Amino acid sequence: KKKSGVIPXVXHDCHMNXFQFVFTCCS
């Protein structure tokens, strides 16, 4: 269970995606 959706726009290059959180990012 990876796909959760913590906070979209927290990654380092996130640009509105939400694919998976490898370390908190949403890309």
Residue-wise DSSP of 1-27: -------TT-SSS--S-----SSS---
The closest alpha carbon to 25, from 1, 2, 7, 4, belongs to: 7
Spatial neighbors of 6 by CB under 8 A, at least 6 apart, are: 21, 24, 26
How many Cβ atoms sit within 10 Å of the Cβ of residue 15?
A: 9
Residue 25 near residue 9 (C-beta atoms within 8 A): no
Q: Cα 11 vs. chain centroid, distance in angstroms?
A: 6
Residue 19 near residue 5 (C-beta atoms within 8 A): no
